[PDB]
Design a protein around this motif. Structure first.
Motif, PDB file in Angstrom:
ATOM      1  N   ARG A 245       4.231   0.490  13.784  1.00 49.41           N
ATOM      2  CA  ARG A 245       4.886   1.663  13.209  1.00 49.41           C
ATOM      3  C   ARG A 245       4.022   2.909  13.383  1.00 49.41           C
TER       4      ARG A 245
ATOM      5  N   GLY B 168      -4.634  21.453  22.448  1.00 44.16           N
ATOM      6  CA  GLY B 168      -3.614  21.790  23.434  1.00 44.16           C
ATOM      7  C   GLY B 168      -3.743  23.219  23.923  1.00 44.16           C
TER       8      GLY B 168
ATOM      9  N   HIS C  42       3.208   8.199  16.041  1.00 40.23           N
ATOM     10  CA  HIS C  42       2.161   9.099  16.500  1.00 40.23           C
ATOM     11  C   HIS C  42       2.120   9.289  18.002  1.00 40.23           C
TER      12      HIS C  42
ATOM     13  N   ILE D 208      -5.321  18.697  17.046  1.00 37.51           N
ATOM     14  CA  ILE D 208      -4.572  18.384  18.271  1.00 37.51           C
ATOM     15  C   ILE D 208      -3.901  19.635  18.843  1.00 37.51           C
ATOM     16  N   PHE D 209      -3.295  20.450  17.987  1.00 39.60           N
ATOM     17  CA  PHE D 209      -2.711  21.714  18.437  1.00 39.60           C
ATOM     18  C   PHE D 209      -3.766  22.604  19.092  1.00 39.60           C
TER      19      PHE D 209
ATOM     20  N   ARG E 121      -5.779  10.859   0.424  1.00 37.91           N
ATOM     21  CA  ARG E 121      -6.390  10.583   1.715  1.00 37.91           C
ATOM     22  C   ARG E 121      -5.461  10.994   2.847  1.00 37.91           C
TER      23      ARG E 121
ATOM     24  N   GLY F  38     -15.259  -2.168  -4.178  1.00 40.02           N
ATOM     25  CA  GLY F  38     -15.128  -2.226  -2.730  1.00 40.02           C
ATOM     26  C   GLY F  38     -14.146  -1.209  -2.168  1.00 40.02           C
TER      27      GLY F  38
ATOM     28  N   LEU G 284       2.320  18.027  19.230  1.00 40.02           N
ATOM     29  CA  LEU G 284       1.350  19.015  18.761  1.00 40.02           C
ATOM     30  C   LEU G 284       0.536  19.576  19.912  1.00 40.02           C
ATOM     31  N   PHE G 285       0.039  18.692  20.783  1.00 42.73           N
ATOM     32  CA  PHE G 285      -0.653  19.115  21.988  1.00 42.73           C
ATOM     33  C   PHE G 285       0.182  20.094  22.797  1.00 42.73           C
TER      34      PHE G 285
ATOM     35  N   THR H 263     -10.537   1.495  -3.025  1.00 39.98           N
ATOM     36  CA  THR H 263      -9.725   2.245  -3.974  1.00 39.98           C
ATOM     37  C   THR H 263      -8.229   2.124  -3.676  1.00 39.98           C
ATOM     38  N   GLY H 264      -7.804   1.055  -3.007  1.00 41.30           N
ATOM     39  CA  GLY H 264      -6.394   0.771  -2.912  1.00 41.30           C
ATOM     40  C   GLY H 264      -5.590   1.575  -1.905  1.00 41.30           C
ATOM     41  N   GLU H 265      -6.209   2.434  -1.092  1.00 39.87           N
ATOM     42  CA  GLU H 265      -5.488   2.981   0.054  1.00 39.87           C
ATOM     43  C   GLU H 265      -5.480   1.968   1.187  1.00 39.87           C
ATOM     44  N   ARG H 266      -4.488   2.094   2.055  1.00 41.87           N
ATOM     45  CA  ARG H 266      -4.362   1.159   3.166  1.00 41.87           C
ATOM     46  C   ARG H 266      -5.507   1.365   4.163  1.00 41.87           C
ATOM     47  N   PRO H 267      -6.196   0.307   4.587  1.00 41.54           N
ATOM     48  CA  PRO H 267      -7.350   0.497   5.476  1.00 41.54           C
ATOM     49  C   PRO H 267      -6.959   1.142   6.803  1.00 41.54           C
ATOM     50  N   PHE H 268      -7.862   1.968   7.327  1.00 46.29           N
ATOM     51  CA  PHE H 268      -7.558   2.707   8.550  1.00 46.29           C
ATOM     52  C   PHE H 268      -7.363   1.768   9.735  1.00 46.29           C
TER      53      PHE H 268
ATOM     54  N   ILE I 122       1.559  13.341  18.131  1.00 42.67           N
ATOM     55  CA  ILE I 122       0.342  13.798  18.787  1.00 42.67           C
ATOM     56  C   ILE I 122       0.648  14.566  20.069  1.00 42.67           C
TER      57      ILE I 122
ATOM     58  N   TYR J 251       0.827  -1.197   0.000  1.00 43.61           N
ATOM     59  CA  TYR J 251       0.000   0.000   0.000  1.00 43.61           C
ATOM     60  C   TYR J 251       0.865   1.253   0.000  1.00 43.61           C
ATOM     61  N   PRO J 252       0.435   2.323  -0.654  1.00 40.01           N
ATOM     62  CA  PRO J 252       1.160   3.576  -0.510  1.00 40.01           C
ATOM     63  C   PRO J 252       0.907   4.150   0.871  1.00 40.01           C
TER      64      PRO J 252
ATOM     65  N   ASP K 242     -10.975   7.491  -9.191  1.00 35.86           N
ATOM     66  CA  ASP K 242     -11.767   6.958  -8.084  1.00 35.86           C
ATOM     67  C   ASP K 242     -10.866   6.724  -6.870  1.00 35.86           C
ATOM     68  N   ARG K 243     -10.996   7.554  -5.845  1.00 32.31           N
ATOM     69  CA  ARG K 243     -10.178   7.431  -4.652  1.00 32.31           C
ATOM     70  C   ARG K 243     -11.050   7.642  -3.418  1.00 32.31           C
TER      71      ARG K 243
ATOM     72  N   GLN L 287     -17.150   6.549   0.997  1.00 36.43           N
ATOM     73  CA  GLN L 287     -17.996   5.368   0.846  1.00 36.43           C
ATOM     74  C   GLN L 287     -18.675   4.994   2.157  1.00 36.43           C
TER      75      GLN L 287
ATOM     76  N   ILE M 216      -4.022   0.507   9.786  1.00 34.38           N
ATOM     77  CA  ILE M 216      -3.000   1.493  10.121  1.00 34.38           C
ATOM     78  C   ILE M 216      -2.916   1.703  11.632  1.00 34.38           C
TER      79      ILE M 216
END
Ligand SMILES: CCCCCCCCCCCCCCCCCC(=O)OC[C@H](CO[C@@H]1O[C@H](CO[C@H]2O[C@H](CO)[C@H](O)[C@H](O)[C@H]2O)[C@H](O)[C@H](O)[C@H]1O)OC(=O)CCCCCCCCCCCCCCCCC
Ligand SMILES: CCCCCCCCCCCCCCCCCC(=O)OC[C@H](CO[C@@H]1O[C@H](CO[C@H]2O[C@H](CO)[C@H](O)[C@H](O)[C@H]2O)[C@H](O)[C@H](O)[C@H]1O)OC(=O)CCCCCCCCCCCCCCCCC
Ligand code: CLA
Ligand code: CLA
Ligand code: CLA
Ligand code: CLA
Ligand code: CLA
Ligand code: CLA
Ligand SMILES: CC1=C(/C=C/C(C)=C/C=C/C(C)=C/C=C/C=C(C)/C=C/C=C(C)/C=C/C2=C(C)CCCC2(C)C)C(C)(C)CCC1
Ligand SMILES: CC1=C(/C=C/C(C)=C/C=C/C(C)=C/C=C/C=C(C)/C=C/C=C(C)/C=C/C2=C(C)CCCC2(C)C)C(C)(C)CCC1
Ligand SMILES: CCCCCCCCCCCCCCCCCC(=O)O
Ligand code: OEX
Ligand SMILES: [Cl-]
Ligand SMILES: [Cl-]
Ligand SMILES: [Fe+2]
Lengths: 34, 82, 334, 137, 341, 36, 442
Positions: free
Chosen positions: B16, A24, B21, A20-21, A8, B1, B28-29, B3-8, B25, A2-3, E14-15, C251, B11
């Motif tokens: 990693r 804070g 994060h 988040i900022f 996204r 189904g 930033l806070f 579009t080829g992005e990595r499922p949340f 995270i 996956y990229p 399509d994204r 979606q 992630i």
């Protein structure tokens, strides 16, 4: 395979980073006194 | 189904992901926090501090009453606290 | 051939053009009474001393109202929550002066509407349907109970229930704001979200289905003739509509289960309107909207007004003016 | 603007002696005013008798003058009507009537000074709002 | 096979989040409107334009924060950052109310963006553009209320301010000054919004209680398949129920769903029209015949006269603090007040 | 007024008895599937 | 066939696991009762009226005679602690049995023991469980009687001399009195059972209810439902649930009106004044102030022509004027000494008003049950300062909401039980759609 960096990826971080900022900054505010 | 992005859900259960994060995270806070605790937020945006809405023996609002001199008017009011 | 059983068979018959049913045996007379008295009073009732101070308010057409200003006026504050049927008045003249018709109409109507809800359950059972349409109707029904019965019970007087008229309604909602700050109350905020959202999703759903209608017609005929009552095939293409809406947003923010979708449609406004009926019902006992009056002050102690303090100036002007002859003492405690 | 000593300086007595409160005493006074007084005296008015308020100028014209720490401390011990002609301990909270007004039981002498000080400071901060009632909200 | 077609190729891939040509307008403008609101409500005062605190930084909560309108003395200035008012100074821009025009104008072009996006996606996916058509009502409301209304008035100052309580103040302003509840264009809007929510609830409830048994579970959601041909609930039984309960029912699924589009869209359009009138103070404020009678006859009283007394109270008690540029000083003796209160 | 009162008491009683007795007359059985 | 979000419906026919849910949940109720009491106690400050402090449980305990003396003054906080600790301790035992029966115990009971096991469709067994619980309930109402008559009495706001704990030696048994309340109109000046205004009637009513519940319980152990009841009802777990939800809803609505109007079993000393009380106390207050200045309050005509201080009700009684005309049905111990046969007595008003009455009126007027959601006290236009919302507003609003939702739950579960019993709760059979075998309406 996956990229990692996508449109996204950008939409997400375009919102999450300032949120988040801002959370804070707003938490510090609870300790301001007049 | 898809579009080829990595499922949340893939992630955010990934190691990693949290390795990066758990730093990004909180940092930033803490940045936003310092933005306020240093007083910098006040000066950037022009927001009155609790001691600078009014002058000591004043109860008039420092209301902008001119369009093209308005910037000058605000500066005048602000001097009347210094 | 048994007489009672024949009558039972007719009451509960699914062949009557309008279902009667056991709930209808109570609903039919109570709603006819409330309707006939409402129409007569709207057209011809004389002025009513709503606030008990011998200052009668004219509600009917023949006494100088139009459709917008007319109202059946609530019953006298002198009566409070006392039951005031016709036969408790020395005469119809007295009963009219003191607002008797309002009591007759709202009691008959609340009973008939309650039975309307049960009638919705009952016919669903005779038809072999699922039963919960009536649960949807309990939202509007609870709202009418709140403004006609609950709020009067808590404030002590049917004179503070909602007039049965268009301008009367607005009077009730302005005074409610002055006495309860309803706008700063979260249950009215959920009600607005229930009603705004309901209108949103009404339009959304109507527009998505209309958008994916299957070509069954020519440009010279209404597309509505592409659907025939009782055909088995769906008449639009939910996958094309899911594929449009999933792309307009993303979606997983779009329904392709039509059952989940219509349940969402049912539940959002119903629940929002439950809350706002509960808002009125609980402001009936004076648990009011958030008060941030003078919540911001400066380092010296000067008040620093916010938009809530500006709301409060408006609330004050309503307060000081309403029922302008009716208060002798400095606090409007009910 | 801020809570300068100038504003925390109020009269101690009728002889024009003054006394400068701390920010601490003032916030304690305000806290104690909300505890024991504000159910009737919110904003410096008097809900159960609006004709008498806590504006400095009204207190100044009370008999025993009450526009000073001493007058107000005494008032909280032995309240009188506005002309001083009768004692009203039985319908007005006071140390003298703390059997029937139990919130007054746990008030020390220092607490009374802080309450009095709060009452005398507040109209310097709020002006017309103090005792002016809803017109000024 | 030149650059325009290649860019078209890419904008329309399509994204997860579709972009399109409309995205170029939409996504900048939406994100900036939304960032301006979040920024202003967190950090920016209304002290110099309104005499009001309005940010979290100042002590406000979610209900009372707002991005407030510019001072009345700005007229209808676009209040560009580089314009002659702020003269490029960001801080003064914030203090003069520049974030209000920023949000309003980026918001308007974002709304256009969004409707172009409904057109763009509708065309690619092959469906009729009715969702776009319906969204014309939200646009009509936004422009009439946030743009047309303050343009007919003295300044942007009398536009709505972007905030929860601030919008409540706008509600009450319109009651007291415009008697907007008396306006039949608002009344048609009320009917369309409340008619919409009714139709939403009653249509959902009906579908869910005339379901066909298509599975064996007590959870009836599983027994649907988005590519099934068959209707998942009985229109015939639904029609019988309502005919017997209410007298009349829908019999045409297409009309039904068109009417659900029609009712709330039309109501919102009607309320936009009446606000256009109020831009000019062209109010439905009075009934002349009522006033003539009441002026001559002090025993004559209706809910209509009672409501104007309330309006008159609203105006006099709120105007000094709500319109500070006017320096209204109302001595106590001139405030309208009933007995005791 | 008493003639009226009594008339209304009787009308209301009559209708409420129809309601109670109607729902006691085997109402679970008046559906189109499983009658008992 | 139920989804996770309807997952407790998976318990309908698992009598063992369902016993564990009921008993674990019983433990949470008792836990809350205990924890909450101790929380209120740790916060309680006896110098302050209970109602200035957010208390809802301590007022219930004090009403029962524990902890208080004359005037409702708190003399001893130990009874409150005990009630909290014992409830807290007891919830561990219910917790224990609860999770044991939900996780480890037999999941069905009817194989392990024919006494404890049950079938929902078994009408005899169901009325027997009902009977046992009817007896428990009758015992409980008799415990209230026992307290009042044999273990110290109850707080009596009407007692002479400011209220006090009083032992009840002559509970009312006359059924014309006891059941007279059931037949009073729920409208103003009547108040159905909410108007019970004396502890003799409270205790006697509970003797009756205890005996009726014990008799009812024995009746239901010994009998099975008659055929007319057999044919009237749906006999299923969910149907019984729906019956009880309806009954809880009715009871929640009554409790709402009780705590809002009744100042006998919810004394105003602990709960604060009622809405009608507070409003009556305002008129009293300014009658006193004005009469002290020289005003003749009986002859003073107000703006409307009605008396500024005093007027007649619609049946003639002398009552307070202004908007409180609507609250003239109010009765309270501070006010009754002024009432003569024709209503408020002008000669008692002129001569016999006591300082404690002036104090009480002032107190109740300034603690009217009006306040914001963030507990700013007073009318909605009031500025911040007073942190007060009446316990009566809290107890009325909460229980209105709960009663409303339990009525929704009643309709939900009732309609579903009817549909499931007829066999179409999951939808319409395509091959046997009833309307397709009915003739068209037109
Ligand atoms: C639906 C699709 C949605 C798509 C929309 C996408 C967003 C579009 C962006 C729109 C930007 C419009 C802002 C225009 C600002 C404006 O108007 O600004 C107002 C100015 C006029 O300025 C005002 O003028 C007033 C009158 O002044 C005159 O009169 C005074 C009295 O004597 C003095 O003599 C003074 O010198 C003299 O100029 C006062 O001075 C005000 O303070 C000052 O603001 O006109 C001007 O800029 C231009 C006026 C002529 C152009 C009219 C364009 C139409 C816009 C108005 C349409 C609504 C109609 C309103 C009536 C209802
Ligand atoms: C099974 C099916 C049921 C069929 C029932 C149909 C017939 C009844 C219908 C309900 C009508 C109720 C009207 C309530 C009127 C009102 O004055 O009701 C309040 C009365 C209390 O009466 C008050 O009772 C008072 C009693 O206090 C008196 O005595 C006290 C004793 O200490 C004090 O001394 C006090 O000062 C003194 O005044 C006075 O008498 C008041 O004047 C009198 O108003 O409550 C009481 O009867 C309690 C009654 C509670 C019912 C009200 C709840 C209604 C909720 C509707 C739910 C809607 C849901 C929507 C669904 C969708
Ligand atoms: C599609 C995106 C988009 C759109 C439609 C807008 C629209 C607007 N913005 Mg926003 N803005 C955007 C993106 C966008 N912005 C982005 C990405 C940012 C972050 C950098 C900002 C930051 C921003 C700020 C900070 C402000 C605005 C403002 C404005 C308004 C005034 C714009 C104006 O006068 O431009 C004038 C310019 C044009 C219209 C461009 C025309 C160019 C033409 C096609 C070519 C002309 C020839 C060219 C100049 C030749 C070069 C010559 C050179 C060699 C010498 C308007 C509502 C102002 C505002 O809201 O006021 C309240 C304001 O202060 N915007
Ligand atoms: C004695 C009371 C009682 C009992 C024992 C039941 C029991 C049952 N109900 Mg009924 N129900 C009740 C009251 C009751 N209900 C009431 C009062 C209502 C109206 C609101 C309903 C409405 C209702 C519906 C709509 C449905 C049921 C269903 C069911 C079954 C599955 C329930 C389940 O798994 O919930 C699981 C629990 C959850 C999903 C959690 C819900 C959380 C609630 C909504 C929010 C509470 C938040 C709270 C207010 C504060 C939160 C603060 C924050 C910090 C979190 C079960 C037989 C289902 C059924 O028909 O079964 C056959 C079903 O679909 N119930
Ligand atoms: C008052 C709240 C309440 C109660 C008492 C129950 C009780 C029960 N539920 Mg329900 N349920 C509830 C709320 C509740 N539920 C809500 C809100 C939801 C929606 C999220 C559900 C959804 C749900 C589903 C989906 C299912 C149940 C099931 C069950 C039963 C079996 C659970 C099991 O095997 O646990 C297994 C869990 C564990 C082993 C984890 C530990 C759980 C323990 C008990 C925690 C207690 C900790 C406590 C502090 C210890 C104190 C001990 C001390 C006194 C000694 C059980 C009787 C199941 C059932 O019916 O089986 C057929 C089932 O499938 N429930
Ligand atoms: C069901 C009846 C009930 C009632 C009438 C009250 C009433 C009260 N409680 Mg108690 N409380 C309850 C249940 C109840 N509580 C429960 C179940 C818990 C466990 C969490 C507590 C825990 C608790 C604590 C810890 C405290 C109170 C406090 C208070 C007082 C202030 C309430 C307040 O400001 O709320 C603010 C209003 C809200 C939070 C709004 C809730 C809206 C809900 C979530 C929506 C409803 C959805 C449906 C149900 C008030 C007298 C306070 C007090 O003064 O103590 C002496 C206090 O500190 N309560
Ligand atoms: C109403 C609630 C309830 C019900 C119906 C049951 C029913 C049952 N339990 Mg459970 N149980 C409960 C509560 C309940 N239990 C509680 C609260 C606990 C923790 C204390 C337990 C702990 C428990 C265990 C550990 C076991 C059972 C078992 C059993 C079974 C047989 C018990 C037996 O032989 O009787 C025994 C009878 C007596 C001991 C007679 C004495 C009477 C009681 C104890 C005193 C009266 C209490 C009083 C009425 C109320 C409390 C007072 C308070 C208000 C101050 C039966 C199905 C057994 C089982 O399922 O094994 C397969 C088993 O091993 N139970
Ligand atoms: C928790 C309480 C409870 C419950 C759920 C039941 C449940 C039942 N009882 Mg038992 N009962 C109880 C307590 C209870 N009982 C007590 C304490 C006693 C002793 C007095 C009895 C005495 C008793 C007898 C003598 C009989 C039953 C019977 C029955 C069955 C039919 C009930 C029925 O249709 O009534 C529904 C009610 C009616 C059809 C008509 C009366 C309707 C009332 C009076 C109208 C009032 C409505 C009004 C708005 C409410 C306000 C108050 C009102 C007084 C003004 C059912 C299984 C019957 C049976 O089969 O026994 C084997 C039977 O004949 N019960
Ligand atoms: C203006 C401006 C700009 C822009 C900016 C931006 C764009 C910004 C952004 C910003 C952002 C973007 C922000 C964000 C923030 C966020 C936040 C602040 C959030 C929060 C939230 C919350 C708080 C939530 C919570 C919750 C709750 C409450 C409940 C429910 C659940 C939840 C959890 C969700 C610029 C530069 C161009 C320049 C000019 C000016
Ligand atoms: C304690 C007390 C008392 C007493 C009380 C009592 C004595 C009570 C009783 C009560 C009772 C005695 C109750 C009643 C109940 C009843 C009811 C509530 C009923 C219901 C019904 C139903 C529900 C029905 C239904 C149906 C029908 C109609 C038809 C068919 C079907 C069915 C069956 C479903 C007093 C007040 C003195 C005082 C205080 C304390
Ligand atoms: C159609 C898209 C238009 C994009 C507009 C973005 C504008 C970018 C912001 C630039 C603001 C710089 C102004 C500050 C300097 C002004 C100094 C001066 O007035 O001389
Ligand atoms: O009546 Mn109708 O409105 Ca309820 O508060 Mn009090 O009262 Mn009357 O005044 Mn505001
Ligand atoms: Cl009015
Ligand atoms: Cl009054
Ligand atoms: Fe649909």
């Amino acid at each position: 395979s996956y990229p990692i960096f996508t449109v996204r990826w950008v939409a997400v971080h375009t919102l999450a980073v300032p949120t988040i900022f801002f959370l804070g900054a707003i938490a510090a505010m609870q300790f301001i006194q007049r | 189904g898809t579009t080829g992005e990595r499922p949340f859900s893939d992630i955010i259960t990934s190691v990693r992901y949290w390795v990066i994060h758990s730093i990004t995270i909180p940092a930033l806070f803490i940045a936003g926090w310092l933005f306020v605790s240093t007083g910098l937020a006040y000066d950037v945006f022009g927001t009155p501090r609790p001691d600078s809405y009014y002058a000591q023996e004043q109860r008039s609002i420092p209301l902008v009453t001119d369009r093209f001199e308005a910037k000058q008017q605000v500066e005048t009011f602000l001097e009347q606290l210094k | 051939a048994n007489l009672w059983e024949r009558f039972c068979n007719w009451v509960t018959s699914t062949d009557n053009r309008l279902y009667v049913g056991w709930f209808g045996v109570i609903m039919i007379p109570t709603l006819l009474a409330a309707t006939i008295c409402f129409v007569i009073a709207f057209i011809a009732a004389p002025p009513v001393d709503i606030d008990g101070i011998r200052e009668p308010v004219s509600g009917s057409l023949l006494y100088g109202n139009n459709i917008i200003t007319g109202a059946v006026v609530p019953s006298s504050n002198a009566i409070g929550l006392h039951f005031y049927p016709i036969w408790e008045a020395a005469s119809l003249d007295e009963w009219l002066y003191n607002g008797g018709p309002y009591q007759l109409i709202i009691f008959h109507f609340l009973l008939g509407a309650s039975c309307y809800m049960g009638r919705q359950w009952e016919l669903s059972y005779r038809l072999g349907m699922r039963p919960w349409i009536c649960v949807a109707y309990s939202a509007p029904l609870a709202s009418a109970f709140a403004v006609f019965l609950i709020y009067p019970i808590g404030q002590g007087s049917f004179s503070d229930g909602m007039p049965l008229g268009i301008s009367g309604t607005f009077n009730f909602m302005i005074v409610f704001q002055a006495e309860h700050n309803i706008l700063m109350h979260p249950f009215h905020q959920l009600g607005v979200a229930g009603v705004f959202g309901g209108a949103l999703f009404c339009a959304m759903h109507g527009s998505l289905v209309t958008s994916s209608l299957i070509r069954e017609t020519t440009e010279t005929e209404s597309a509505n003739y592409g659907y025939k009552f009782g055909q088995e095939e769906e008449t639009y293409n939910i996958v094309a509509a899911h594929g449009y809406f999933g792309r307009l947003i993303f979606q997983y923010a779009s329904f392709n289960n039509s059952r989940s979708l219509h349940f969402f449609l049912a539940a959002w406004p119903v629940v929002g309107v439950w809350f706002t009926a509960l808002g009125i019902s609980t402001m009936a006992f004076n648990l009011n909207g958030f008060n941030f009056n003078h919540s911001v002050i400066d380092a010296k102690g000067n008040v620093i007004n916010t938009w809530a303090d500006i709301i409060n100036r408006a609330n004050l002007g309503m307060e000081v003016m309403h029922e302008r002859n009716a208060h002798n003492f400095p606090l409007d405690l009910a | 603007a801020e809570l300068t000593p100038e504003v925390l300086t109020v009269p101690l007595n009728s002889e024009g002696k003054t006394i400068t409160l701390t920010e601490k005493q003032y916030l304690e006074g305000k806290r104690l005013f909300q505890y024991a007084c504000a159910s009737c005296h919110v904003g410096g008015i008097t809900k159960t008798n609006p004709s008498l308020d806590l504006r400095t100028e009204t207190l100044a014209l009370a008999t025993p003058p009450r526009d000073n720490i001493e007058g107000l401390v005494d008032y909280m011990k032995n309240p009188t009507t506005y002309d001083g002609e009768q004692e009203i301990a039985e319908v007005h909270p006071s140390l003298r009537s703390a059997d029937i007004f139990p919130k007054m039981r746990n008030l020390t002498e220092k607490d009374l000074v802080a309450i009095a000080g709060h009452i005398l400071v507040e109209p310097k901060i709020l002006g017309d709002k103090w005792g002016g009632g809803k017109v000024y909200y | 096979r030149g650059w325009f077609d290649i860019l078209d190729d890419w904008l329309k891939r399509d994204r997860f989040v579709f972009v399109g040509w409309s995205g170029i307008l939409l996504f900048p403008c939406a994100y900036l409107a939304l960032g301006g609101w979040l920024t202003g409500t967190t950090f920016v005062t209304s002290w110099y334009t309104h005499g009001l605190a309005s940010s979290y930084l100042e002590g406000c909560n979610f209900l009372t924060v707002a991005v407030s309108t510019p001072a009345n003395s700005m007229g209808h200035s676009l209040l560009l950052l580089w314009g002659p008012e702020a003269q490029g100074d960001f801080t003064r821009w914030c203090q003069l109310g520049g974030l209000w025009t920023f949000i309003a104008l980026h918001g308007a072009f974002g709304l256009i963006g969004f409707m172009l996006r409904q057109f763009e996606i509708a065309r690619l996916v092959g469906v009729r553009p009715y969702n776009a058509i319906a969204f014309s009502a939200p646009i009509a409301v936004f422009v009439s209320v946030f743009l047309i209304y303050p343009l007919g008035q003295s300044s942007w100052f009398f536009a709505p301010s972007f905030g929860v309580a601030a919008i409540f103040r706008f509600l009450l302003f319109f009651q007291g000054f415009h008697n907007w509840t008396l306006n039949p264009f608002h009344m048609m809007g009320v009917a369309g919004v409340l008619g919409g929510a009714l139709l939403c609830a009653i249509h959902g409830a009906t579908v869910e209680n005339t379901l066909f048994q298509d599975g064996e579970g007590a959870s009836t959601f599983r027994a649907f398949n988005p590519t099934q041909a068959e209707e998942t609930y009985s229109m015939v039984t639904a029609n019988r129920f309502w005919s017997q309960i209410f007298g009349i029912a829908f019999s045409n699924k297409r009309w039904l769903h068109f009417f659900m589009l029609f009712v709330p869209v039309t109501g919102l359009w009607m309320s936009a029209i009446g606000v256009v009138g109020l831009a000019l103070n062209l109010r439905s404020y009075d009934f002349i015949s009522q006033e003539i009678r009441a002026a001559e006859d002090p025993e004559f009283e209706t809910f209509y006269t009672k409501n104007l007394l309330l309006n008159e109270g609203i105006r006099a008690w709120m105007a000094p603090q709500d319109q500070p540029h006017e320096n209204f000083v109302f001595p106590e003796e001139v405030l309208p007040r009933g007995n005791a209160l | 007024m008493e003639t009226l009162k009594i008339t209304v008491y009787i009308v209301v009683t009559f209708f409420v008895l129809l309601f109670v007795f109607g729902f006691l007359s085997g109402d679970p059985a008046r559906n189109p599937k499983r009658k008992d | 066939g139920f989804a996770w979000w309807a997952g407790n419906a998976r318990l309908i026919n698992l009598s063992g696991k369902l016993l564990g849910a009921h008993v674990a949940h019983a433990g949470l109720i008792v836990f809350w009762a205990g924890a909450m009491t101790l929380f209120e106690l740790a916060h309680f400050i006896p110098e302050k009226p209970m109602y200035e402090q957010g208390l809802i449980l301590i007022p219930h305990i004090a009403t029962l005679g524990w902890g208080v003396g004359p005037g409702g003054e708190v003399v001893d906080t130990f009874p409150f602690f005990v009630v909290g600790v014992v409830h807290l301790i007891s919830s561990a035992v219910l917790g224990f049995g609860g999770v044991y029966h939900a996780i480890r115990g037999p999941e069905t009971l009817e194989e392990y023991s024919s006494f404890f096991g049950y079938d929902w469709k078994d009408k005899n067994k169901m009325t027997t469980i009902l009977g046992f619980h009817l007896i428990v309930l009758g015992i409980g109402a008799l415990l209230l009687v026992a307290k009042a008559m044999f273990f110290g009495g109850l707080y009596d706001t009407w007692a002479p001399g400011g209220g006090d704990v009083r032992v009840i030696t002559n509970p009312t048994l006359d059924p014309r009195v006891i059941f007279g309340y059931l037949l009073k109109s729920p409208f103003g000046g009547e108040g159905w059972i909410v108007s019970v205004n004396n502890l003799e009637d409270v205790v006697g009513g509970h003797i009756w209810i205890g005996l009726i519940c014990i008799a009812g319980g024995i009746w239901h152990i010994l009998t099975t439902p008659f055929g007319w009841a057999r044919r009237a009802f749906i006999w299923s777990g969910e149907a019984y649930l729906s019956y009880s939800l309806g009954a809880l809803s009715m009871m929640g609505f009554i409790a709402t009106c009780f705590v809002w109007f009744n100042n006998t079993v919810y004394p105003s000393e602990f709960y604060g004044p009622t809405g009608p009380e507070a409003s009556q106390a305002q008129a009293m207050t300014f009658l006193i102030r004005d009469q002290k200045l020289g005003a003749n309050v009986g002859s003073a005509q107000g703006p409307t022509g009605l008396g500024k201080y005093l007027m007649r009700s619609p049946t003639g009684e002398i009552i307070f004027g202004g908007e409180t005309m609507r609250f003239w049905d109010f009765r309270g111990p501070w006010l009754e000494p002024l009432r003569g046969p024709n209503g408020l007595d002008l000669n008692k008003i002129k001569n016999d008003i006591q300082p404690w009455q002036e104090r009480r009126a002032a107190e109740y007027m300034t603690h009217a049950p009006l306040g914001s959601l963030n507990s700013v006290g007073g009318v909605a236009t009031e500025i911040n300062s007073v942190n007060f919302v009446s316990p009566r507003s809290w107890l009325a609003t909460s229980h209105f909401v709960l009663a409303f939702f339990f009525l929704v739950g009643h309709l939900w579960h009732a309609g579903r039980a009817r549909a499931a019993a007829a066999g179409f709760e999951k939808g319409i059979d395509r091959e046997s759609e009833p309307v397709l075998s009915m003739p068209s309406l037109d």
